[PDB]
Amino acid sequence: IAQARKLVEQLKMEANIDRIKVSKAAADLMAYCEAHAKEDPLLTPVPASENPF
Template structure:
């Protein structure tokens, strides 16, 4: 009997998860792509991969200069 109630409880958990997933608002791929392209176009000036850095000091990925004493 214990195994049966455990299985029943697991099935209830699965059903609840499926209900939550079914309630999620869905969008078509074309809508999602259009929104993504709009976002990218609006923010492309802030994208350092496209525009580059204004100076090397601003670049967090620049090679660190090492201090050497001769």
Template sequence: MSNKEAIANVQRQLKQLRQEAATPRIPLSKACSDLMQFCQEHQKSDILVTGINPSENPYKETKGCVVL
């Protein structure tokens, strides 16, 4: 790696670190309470919680063809 490439690499890393340092921070307790509130508000419309209505399930197993 040439000297110019090394300098460019360090400059990119420095730019990334400055962007990360400028990111606003919130306390973990606030983030957790916000996440819990969001989950509770959207729980009724979450398919993973409520399940899929069997009549609307596109992946349900169909009856196979029986040949006698």
């Protein structure tokens, strides 16, 4: 009817975008995780005076 036209229009709207490389996205996730690992309370356990629980 008309649902298939909207489906292929959505597929064409998704198909023409920019897709960066998986190595770049992996390096960005690694850089974000290693750049904020000092301010992670559950990762590195803080002492009991810093801990509100």
